[PDB]
Design a protein around this ligand. Structure first.
Ligand code: CLA
Ligand code: CLA
Ligand code: CLA
Ligand code: CLA
Ligand code: CLA
Ligand code: CLA
Ligand code: CLA
Ligand SMILES: CC1=C(/C=C/C(C)=C/C=C/C(C)=C/C=C/C=C(C)/C=C/C=C(C)/C=C/C2=C(C)CCCC2(C)C)C(C)(C)CCC1
Ligand SMILES: CC1=C(/C=C/C(C)=C/C=C/C(C)=C\C=C\C=C(C)\C=C\C=C(C)\C=C\C2=C(C)CCCC2(C)C)C(C)(C)CCC1
Ligand SMILES: CC1=C(C/C=C(\C)CCC[C@H](C)CCC[C@H](C)CCCC(C)C)C(=O)c2ccccc2C1=O
Ligand SMILES: CC1=C(C/C=C(\C)CCC[C@H](C)CCC[C@H](C)CCCC(C)C)C(=O)c2ccccc2C1=O
Ligand code: SF4
Ligand code: SF4
Lengths: 739, 27, 151, 80, 31, 138, 69, 141
């Protein structure tokens, strides 16, 4: 045997190379390790969380330090529309002189990378103005990572290891996260915005050296111990305000103007501080809800077990049986993980959908490439998180679901009618797919034969009506908030809209991306998204719900989450496992997010260049997507290096080709399967053992082919890496060669 | 006898038809 | 193998052999001798052969050559359809057909001949048939439209 | 080693023993079926995990069950 | 202004401490 | 042990034994043929069965059993014996242990790994959490 | 039960759960699963690519419910 | 008129591309009649006959009459198929019948699809439409 892996003796007595590979893939599956108890399990979870927190802090520290050290932060401060932000310096000894000249950009003397995270805009919006502020933030995050590392180490010391009853205290955690994390952290951020970010927006330096001696409001802390709150909102920052300077500077610190700052092109900072105040107060109230140890409070378990509505029968909350769902939630870490990843994926996607249309940062809507990168990044993260949510739901259903403790409740009735669930998911998937592919191919065929008038073009009149209901008078609906006389517009009893002038100018001045104009191309694409979401959901739900057992395999719970198959018997059982359904749905999620990001990017290129007719006339067939979006915009990307020389796009051309290579390399692992490679490695073993001067050196682990699940994972990882790198290369180069 | 579920579905249908009346200019 | 051979053939003829002769007797090659300097990098193959020469098959709509653009797209579709059969296994498909059978059983419409997923070998064969048809037909439509519009 | 478990729905048709490529299973006396024999696995250290026995099993669901576990040289089928 | 050589060196020396804390957390998680 | 039998007339092949035969374990199939005949070796190629006792060393038990099943049994040879041989020279009889082939029920054979329930009566992994207990334990 | 009696299966692991099949024999001896039930929907059982399955299986009397006589 | 849409008549782009009508069929006119028919539609910025799927009984011919046509034909198809499947399950040669269609019975169940929806209503009334949940197979959980 070998020492490695310590956590699994089954892999430790393995004499093959597989012992290494599986160990790397089972190092974080703590429950399946040898000698695992629930106590030590949960404590390891806690310390790994602290370690991850420290990694996050080190990462932000690195970004801040490289911008402060090798970036052009202050040069970008003085001219944020015409200066490229520098990520970090390049040190590649293999560069020729042409690549040194080509990467000497953004006012630098050396080769540098252009930052496309938008971190410059977010740091400029939050009051950071010199290199010293960023350097201080970098060292402070270096301190915070150290504190997180020490806390993770401490909570595994014998005296400081938290008890299992502490970990299972959902009431206390909910209260302290809603009011402490979610509430007090938002209160503190409103405090930062009011105390620092708004003064630096108005030209004033409120550093750590004078914040105790600088009042936020000219007669401040008097109006809000008296109910005179409106004094903090009397003179808002003027529409002639120049950001970072006192020219036209107002003095309000909490407004509800609505719409955008006109020069900075983002939302108002005072409006953000007021939002954060409202959110903090609401979240402290929400965290004042559950019964921890002071008698007052709610308890979730009693609500889940409640069957009494003031004398009525009620099966439970909403007359739906809910017994043991508290126990199911709190005892299964995989249920918790699946739920929390679903919530996280939803809000990450909401972040993506809200930042492009409500830009929150100074002049970030003018940095088109960073906006593209941020939308695409957060949508891909959201897709990955949703797939992980459903994967851990499946893992919970194979490893933690007790039908006895869930006998009767909502989860049991879902498991009752899982076939109707999966079948109607199949129906809506086929529905959407058949019709969207059909309308697209009809448009393609009639445009091909020189007849674009025969295109089935369907206006998104429901979403256009919603846009009108937000205030866009372009469509001519004359409905709520686009009629000045609707009771929604005037708010008849209180007359307290006040957001509405700013928002109405925002919605009815096309210079932004707030509720962009949509047409039949947008209809067809949104149905492609609907198809993609439904089919990825279908794969993941069929995997999770039919993971405990199938009609083909009615003992699938006993084989675990990941297993290759049940063999070629019973008709053939390739990819029967619940891991394999995750593996299938990852491709579908990648395709769906590629669709959403293609849509976003082509529409925004048409909007930024002003040629919106390009999208509104060519996105209805699918050669428009190939010619006017994929073939065209790659043109500068692919000339990143040519026989005539190297541009600064040589990185993105090289990474474009590299992503194509990784993506195609994955196809090898996904298409060719194991026994071929095992038979080939057998001949290689024979050749090595019968070669003179080579038989003197022998392997310590016997060479075997990759396992079935392993190479499924390897091909999926290669496919995903190639997918992501290829699209990131195309996005950055097609959006950075112009704007 | 389907009373609870019918009430909730009828409520949701009523919200749908209220938005439809907004759409068609009746409201 | 055969795709790379026909790519080499197409680019070598279009760059160093095929073209027009002037009255004075000067050969103006179709792609102007880019092969000696572009075909040594994968970027050059992607740019000056695959990106550049596909302009004809993608601008082909509305003319005598629109059907080649249609089959270019349709063959891309069939090739990507292949990867469903190639990357997946029949356990999933049998399990999903099972719930669709439940739906059919509910409305008294499940057929006498039991629906089954395709076998492992059959799934592999369908994947390879679609892959070959899609890739070959994409190259065929590309070749035909490009060398008819330009040659 | 892989784990081969025989469940009492066995009808003793001997089809799993006849299909084992590595001589893992054998027929032993048992009064629980009409055939008078149950399959058994004294030699699961020689099990490669091919699941030919489950393919050969005619009971629904299977009386023989192969659970792939820790891999050794014998269970990996390495001739080297 | 710009970062000085001393600020960069101080950053290296300060980041030496999370290195030891990371090593301690890794060795304690290994046990 | 001391395995008797003439080697079959085989020209050798690159598919035979490797280092594992000499340092870990190897296998030998001994049978008796009534006549000089032809059989396909599991390490590919034809070989000539000598009349009398034939002895073949293979690298895996499964190769010996494939030799017995596809070559000896259809040639009416059912007296073969498969042994495992260790590097020190120790020989252990393996395939027809109690003299009766495993697919014939033999009195005196005991049942190993027989579970007295069905597949459906197996427990749930959720009840069968942190413990040595697995869903297939008797 | 008795031979020829249509019966419903209450065995969850069975392919024919909640479905009817004719009883072809009840074993008089004291075995755990005496009832032979012959269905018309064949099984999954067989190698991959094989066009068929089994239509005959064995069940206990507590895993079989006589709907008809 | 809805959602900023205009009729194709007062659409300049529409008349511009109608001045260059291609010929889809072997008609000498072809494109002229196509365009004079498409003129009644609601065109747009591109001068193309956009469709509204809204009920909107004036512009009901863009979805609703084709919707009814499709639903009637496809429900005819489905009811004919269901009737045939129900009627061959009676014979023990059903598996032979699914590959070798019993053509007189096929036409018999074909010709009664003209009353496809009403009959299904009676089935929805009767209970001879949906199978009970205890008569259909299901996997464990
Ligand atoms: C032969 C091809 C080649 C090679 C070897 C490199 C190498 C490098 N390039 Mg590069 N580059 C190339 C081609 C190449 N380039 C081309 C053709 C272009 C376009 C002209 C560029 C343009 C370019 C730019 C703009 C930059 C570089 C940079 C770099 C340096 C990265 C420094 C670093 O952080 O390492 C660390 C590597 C990683 C963090 C990634 C490794 C992740 C792997 C996949 C997984 C590892 C995880 C695993 C658990 C580790 C195992 C254990 C391990 C600790 C042993 C590196 C020396 C950067 C630089 O100069 O930095 C100072 C820089 O910004 N290059
Ligand atoms: C006031 C008390 C308090 C506070 C502040 C926390 C805070 C925290 N706990 Mg804790 N906890 C507490 C009391 C508290 N706890 C008590 C009393 C118990 C006993 C029941 C627990 C038991 C407990 C356990 C078992 C765990 C935690 C964990 C955590 C961490 C959550 C993960 C994380 O870092 O992301 C922080 C998330 C946010 C800051 C916000 C979440 C999402 C918001 C709503 C979206 C808005 C973001 C905003 C737009 C940001 C703009 C982005 C831009 C600036 C870049 C977090 C720091 C976990 C951990 O990581 O361990 C170290 C975990 O293991 N807690
Ligand atoms: C929770 C975060 C937070 C923290 C730590 C502080 C801290 C402080 N605030 Mg303050 N403040 C905050 C949020 C916060 N604020 C928010 C969200 C608002 C908007 C309602 C205000 C509006 C405000 C005003 C108007 C004033 C302060 C002032 C002060 C300072 C003196 C303490 C006092 O008299 O009151 C002190 C350093 C006073 C000061 O003089 O600053 C030096 C001052 O007049 N704050
Ligand atoms: C909150 C986030 C979170 C957490 C804490 C977990 C935690 C866990 N997951 Mg999970 N998961 C998540 C999100 C999360 N997951 C998401 C978002 C997905 C979708 C992808 C998944 C899908 C998933 C599956 C299918 C499984 C798990 C499993 C597990 C468990 C064991 C992990 C393990 O050891 O395998 C570790 C895995 C690795 C070490 C391989 C990592 C692959 C590398 C990092 C890819 C990088 C590519 C390359 C290096 C990039 C190079 C770029 C360069 C070339 C340019 C563990 C409890 C496993 C389990 O135990 O099932 C019962 C299981 O099978 N997860
Ligand atoms: C372009 C490639 C492609 C296409 C078209 C599909 C299509 C489909 N996938 Mg998919 N998939 C793919 C790649 C693809 N996949 C890849 C690479 C993976 C990872 C391995 C997956 C993994 C996957 C899973 C796990 C699942 C699917 C499912 C589906 C089906 C859902 C039905 C639907 O939404 O749309 C409608 C159907 C179409 C758009 C295709 C039909 C096209 C025409 C109308 C059919 C007739 C052809 C034409 C007349 C020619 C006749 C042929 C003959 C004359 C020669 C559908 C057929 C899901 C499913 O089956 O739902 C129940 C399912 O769960 N896929
Ligand atoms: C299934 C995948 C697999 C895996 C995970 C391993 C893993 C391992 N093998 Mg193995 N092997 C395999 C398949 C595999 N092998 C196959 C199919 C064969 C043929 C039968 C072998 C034959 C084999 C032998 C003979 C040996 C190993 C050994 C090893 C171990 C050391 C790795 C090594 O030698 O790197 C070798 C490095 C390379 C292959 C890279 C090529 C190096 C080129 C020539 C130049 C690159 C050098 C360059 C300067 C790099 C810059 C370094 C930079 C960081 C400064 C390692 C755990 C050794 C061992 O077990 O130690 C006791 C050993 O002796 N293997
Ligand atoms: C009589 C034939 C018949 C009937 C009444 C149904 C009815 C139904 N099917 Mg099914 N189906 C059929 C044939 C049929 N199907 C065939 C031949 C296939 C293999 C291609 C399928 C594959 C299929 C899938 C994957 C799904 C359904 C689903 C459904 C249900 C939802 C409607 C739907 O999705 O439409 C779509 C149906 C198709 C796209 C199949 C094509 C239509 C065929 C060609 C009609 C068959 C007619 C037959 C050949 C000739 C009969 C005439 C006779 C006189 C000779 C519904 C009850 C869904 C479900 O699960 O319930 C919600 C669903 O996911 N079906
Ligand atoms: C597998 C599984 C699982 C998982 C699951 C998941 C993963 C999920 C999800 C899910 C999701 C992902 C969800 C969601 C949601 C959302 C919603 C439900 C919403 C909404 C909405 C609304 C309601 C809104 C409204 C409104 C509007 C319209 C706008 C304006 C304002 C207002 C508010 C009015 C678990 C773990 C459990 C276990 C079991 C199995
Ligand atoms: C107004 C309108 C609309 C809407 C619509 C909707 C929204 C709907 C719905 C609906 C629903 C919500 C539904 C439902 C359902 C349920 C069920 C349950 C069903 C069914 C079915 C069946 C049962 C069938 C049967 C059959 C027949 C009858 C024949 C053939 C065969 C079969 C079997 C298939 C739109 C705008 C679009 C357009 C315009 C008009
Ligand atoms: C190519 C291929 C192989 C052969 C690949 C093998 C044997 C892996 C050899 C990889 C060598 C060791 C180089 C790997 C280099 C990696 C980049 C290093 C990563 C190591 C991590 C631990 C960091 C299989 O074994 C296989 C098995 C099952 C289905 C499909 C396939 C398959 O397609
Ligand atoms: C999609 C897919 C399936 C499902 C594919 C199936 C079920 C093929 C059959 C589909 C067609 C639609 C069957 C047609 C049924 C009737 C003959 C239709 C009547 C035809 C008239 C309309 C003329 C598998 O079975 C499979 C198996 C192994 C690996 C991968 C896959 C795989 O990817
Ligand atoms: S899995 Fe293969 S080696 Fe193991 S008992 Fe079954 S047939 Fe024999
Ligand atoms: S094949 Fe199945 S039923 Fe037959 S003896 Fe083996 S385990 Fe028993």
């Amino acid at each position: 045997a070998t020492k490695f892996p310590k956590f699994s003796q089954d892999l430790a007595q393995d004499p093959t190379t597989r012992r290494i590979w599986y160990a790397i893939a089972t190092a974080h599956d703590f429950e399946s390790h040898d000698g695992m108890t629930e106590e030590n399990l949960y404590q390891k979870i806690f310390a790994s969380h602290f370690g991850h927190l420290a990694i996050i802090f080190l990462w932000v520290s690195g970004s801040l330090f490289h911008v402060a050290w090798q970036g052009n932060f202050e040069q970008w401060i003085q001219d944020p529309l015409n200066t490229r932000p520098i990520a970090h310096a390049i040190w590649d000894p293999q560069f020729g002189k042409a690549a040194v000249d080509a990467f000497t950009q953004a006012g630098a003397s050396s080769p540098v990378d252009i930052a496309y995270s938008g971190v410059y805009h977010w740091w400029y919006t939050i009051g950071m103005r010199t290199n010293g502020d960023l350097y201080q933030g970098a060292i402070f995050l270096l301190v915070l990572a150290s504190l997180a590392l020490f806390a993770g180490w401490l909570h595994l010391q014998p005296k400081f290891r938290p008890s299992l009853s502490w970990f299972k205290n959902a009431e206390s955690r909910l209260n302290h996260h809603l009011a402490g994390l979610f509430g007090v952290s938002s209160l503190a951020w409103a405090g930062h915005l009011i105390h620092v970010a708004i003064p630096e927006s108005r030209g004033q330096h409120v550093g750590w050296d004078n914040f105790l001696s600088t009042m936020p409001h000219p007669a401040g802390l008097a109006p809000f111990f008296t109910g005179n709150w409106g004094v903090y909102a009397q003179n808002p920052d003027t529409a002639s305000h120049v950001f970072g300077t006192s020219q036209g500077a107002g003095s309000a610190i909490l407004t509800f103007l609505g719409g955008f700052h006109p020069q900075t092109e983002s939302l108002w900072l005072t409006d953000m501080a007021h939002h954060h105040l409202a959110i903090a107060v609401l979240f402290i109230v929400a965290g004042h809800m559950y019964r921890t140890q002071f008698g007052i409070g709610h308890s979730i378990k009693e609500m889940m077990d409640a069957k009494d509505f003031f004398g009525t029968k009620v099966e439970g909350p909403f007359n739906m049986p809910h017994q043991g769902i508290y126990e199911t939630y709190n005892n299964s870490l995989h249920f918790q993980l699946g739920w929390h990843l679903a919530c996280l994926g939803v809000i990450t996607s909401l972040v993506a959908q809200h930042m492009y249309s409500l830009p929150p940062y100074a002049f970030i809507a003018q940095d088109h490439t960073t906006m593209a990168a941020l939308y695409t990044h957060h949508q891909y993260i959201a897709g990955f998180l949703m797939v992980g949510a459903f994967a851990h739901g499946a893992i919970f259903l194979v490893r933690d679901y007790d039908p006895v403790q869930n006998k009767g409740n909502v989860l049991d009735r879902v498991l009752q009618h899982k076939e109707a669930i999966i079948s109607h998911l199949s129906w809506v998937s086929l529905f959407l797919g058949f019709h969207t592919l059909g309308l697209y191919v009809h448009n393609d065929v009639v445009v091909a034969f020189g007849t674009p008038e025969k295109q089935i073009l369907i206006e998104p009149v429901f979403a256009q009506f919603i846009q009108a209901a937000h205030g866009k008078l372009l469509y001519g609906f004359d409905t709520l908030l686009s009629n000045p006389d609707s009771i929604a517009a005037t708010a008849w009893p209180n007359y307290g809209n006040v957001w509405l002038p700013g928002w109405l100018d925002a919605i009815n001045s096309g210079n932004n991306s707030l509720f962009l104009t949509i047409g039949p191309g947008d209809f067809l694409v949104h149905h492609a998204i609907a198809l993609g979401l439904h089919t990825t959901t279908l794969i993941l739900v069929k995997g999770a719900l039919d993971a405990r057992g199938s009609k083909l395999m009615p003992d699938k719970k006993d084989f675990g989450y990941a297993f290759p198959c049940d063999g070629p018997g019973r008709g053939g059982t390739c990819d029967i496992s619940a891991w394999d359904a995750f593996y299938l749905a990852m491709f579908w999620m990648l395709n769906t997010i590629g669709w959403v990001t293609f849509y976003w990017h082509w529409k925004h290129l048409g909007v930024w260049e002003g040629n919106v007719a390009q999208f509104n006339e060519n996105s209805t067939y699918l050669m428009g997507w190939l010619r006017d979006y994929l073939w065209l915009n790659s043109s500068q990307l692919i000339n990143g290096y040519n026989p005539f020389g190297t541009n600064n796009l040589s990185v993105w051309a090289w990474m474009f080709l590299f992503g194509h290579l990784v993506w195609a390399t994955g196809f090898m692992f996904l298409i060719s399967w194991r026994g071929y490679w095992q038979e080939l490695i057998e001949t290689l073993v024979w050749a090595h053992e019968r070669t003179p001067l080579a038989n003197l050196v022998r392997w310590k682990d016997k060479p075997v082919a990759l396992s079935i699940v392993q190479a499924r994972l390897v091909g999926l990882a290669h496919f995903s890496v190639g997918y992501v790198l290829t699209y990131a290369a195309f996005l950055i180069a097609s959006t950075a060669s112009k704007y | 006898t389907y009373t609870f579920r019918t009430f909730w579905a009828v409520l949701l249908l009523a919200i749908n038809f209220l938005v439809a009346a907004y759409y068609f200019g009746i409201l | 193998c055969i795709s790379v051979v026909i790519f080499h053939f197409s680019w070598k003829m279009q760059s160093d052999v095929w073209g027009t002769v002037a009255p004075d007797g000067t050969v103006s090659h179709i792609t102007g001798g880019n092969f000696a300097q572009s075909a040594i990098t994968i970027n050059g193959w992607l740019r000056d052969f695959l990106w550049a020469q596909a302009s004809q098959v993608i601008g082909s709509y509305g003319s005598a050559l629109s059907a080649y653009g249609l089959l270019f797209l349709g063959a891309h579709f069939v090739w990507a359809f292949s990867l469903m059969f190639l990357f997946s296994g029949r356990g999933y498909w049998q399990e999903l057909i099972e719930s669709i059978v439940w739906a059919h059983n509910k409305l008294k419409v499940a057929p006498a001949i039991q629906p089954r997923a395709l076998s492992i070998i059959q799934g592999r064969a369908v994947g390879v048939a679609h892959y070959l048809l899609g890739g070959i037909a994409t190259t065929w439509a590309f070749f035909l439209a490009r060398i008819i519009s330009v040659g | 080693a892989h784990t081969v478990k025989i469940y009492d729905t066995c009808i003793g048709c001997t089809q799993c023993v006849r299909a084992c490529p590595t001589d893992v299973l054998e027929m032993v006396p048992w009064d629980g079926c009409k055939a008078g024999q149950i399959a058994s696995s004294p030699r699961t250290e020689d099990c490669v995990g091919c699941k030919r026995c489950e393919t050969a099993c005619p009971t629904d669901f299977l009386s023989i069950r192969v659970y792939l576990g820790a891999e050794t040289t014998r269970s990996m089928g390495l001739a080297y | 202004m710009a970062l000085t050589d001393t600020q960069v060196y101080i950053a290296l020396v300060i980041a030496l401490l999370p290195a030891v804390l990371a090593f301690r957390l890794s060795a304690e998680l290994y046990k | 042990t001391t395995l008797t039998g003439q080697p079959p007339l085989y020209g050798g092949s690159t598919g035979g034994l490797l280092s594992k035969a000499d340092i870990e374990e190897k296998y030998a199939i001994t049978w008796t043929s009534p006549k000089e005949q032809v059989f396909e070796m599991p390490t590919a190629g034809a070989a000539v069965m000598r009349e009398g006792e034939n002895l073949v060393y293979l690298a895996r038990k499964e190769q010996c059993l494939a030799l017995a099943a596809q070559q000896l049994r259809p040639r009416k040879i059912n007296d073969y014996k498969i042994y495992r041989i260790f590097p020190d020279g120790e020989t252990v009889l393996l395939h027809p242990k109690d003299g009766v082939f495993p697919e014939k029920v033999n009195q005196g054979r005991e049942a190993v790994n027989t579970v007295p329930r069905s597949i459906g009566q197996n427990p749930n992994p959720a009840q069968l959490k942190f413990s040595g207990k697995k869903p297939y334990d008797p | 039960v008795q031979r020829g009696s249509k019966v419903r299966i209450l065995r969850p692991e069975s392919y024919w759960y909640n479905e009817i099949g004719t009883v072809a024999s009840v074993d008089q001896s004291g075995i755990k699963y005496p009832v032979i039930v012959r269905f018309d929907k064949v099984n999954y059982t067989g190698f991959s690519g094989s066009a068929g399955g089994v239509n005959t299986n064995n069940f206990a009397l507590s895993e079989v419910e006589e709907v008809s006589a | 008129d809805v959602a900023g849409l205009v009729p194709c008549k007062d659409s300049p782009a529409f008349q511009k591309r109608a001045a260059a009508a291609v010929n889809t069929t072997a008609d000498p006119a072809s494109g002229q009649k196509r365009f004079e028919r498409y003129s009644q539609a609601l065109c747009g910025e591109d001068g193309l006959p956009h469709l509204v799927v809204d009920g909107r009984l004036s512009r009901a011919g863009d979805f609703l009459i084709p919707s009814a046509l499709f639903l009637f034909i496809t429900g005819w198809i489905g009811w004919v198929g269901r009737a045939y499947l129900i009627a061959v399950r009676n014979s023990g040669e059903a598996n032979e019948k699914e590959i070798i269609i019993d053509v007189p019975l096929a036409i018999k169940c074909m010709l009664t699809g003209f009353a496809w929806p009403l009959a299904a209503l009676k089935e929805l009334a009767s209970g001879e439409l949906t199978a009970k949940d205890n008569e259909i197979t299901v996997s464990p959980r």
